[PDB]
């Protein structure tokens, strides 16, 4: 319980990185979260949106 | 069959060449809602039903 500050800072940085790397799984209204899965099924005009 | 008693045929374990089906101009309505008519030949499918 003496090194709580450094561990807290490290945990905050790690959780921020984890959230930033997990936000890639969202769709935001798209049909998939992977750009390769969208470019391999749709055309240029329709996938643009 | 009728529209209220439509028959569904299971299409599985076969090679599907949608390019020949798309090149045929005998079809009057061909609209895809989740895929493209040109990317069908470069994509696999788990289960196809008509």
Curated annotation (Swiss-Prot), chain A:
Changing residue 27 to K: In strain: Omicron/BA.1, Omicron/BA.2, Omicron/BA.2.12.1, Omicron/BA.2.75, Omicron/BA.4, Omicron/BA.5, Omicron/BQ.1.1, Omicron/XBB.1.5, Omicron/EG.5.1. Changing residue 40 to A: In strain: Alpha/B.1.1.7. Changing residue 8 to N: In strain: Delta/B.1.617.2, Mu/B.1.621. Residues 7-49 form a coiled coil. Subunit of the fusion protein that is processed upon entry into the host cell. Mediates fusion of the virion and cellular membranes by functioning as a class I viral fusion protein. Contains a viral fusion peptide that is unmasked after S2 cleavage. This cleavage can occur at the cell membrane by host TMPRSS2 or during endocytosis by host CSTL. In either case, this triggers an extensive and irreversible conformational change that leads to fusion of the viral envelope with the cellular cytoplasmic membrane, releasing viral genomic RNA into the host cell cytoplasm. This is Spike protein S2'. It comes from Severe acute respiratory syndrome coronavirus 2 (2019-nCoV). The gene is S. The chain holds residues 943 to 991 of 1273 of the full protein.
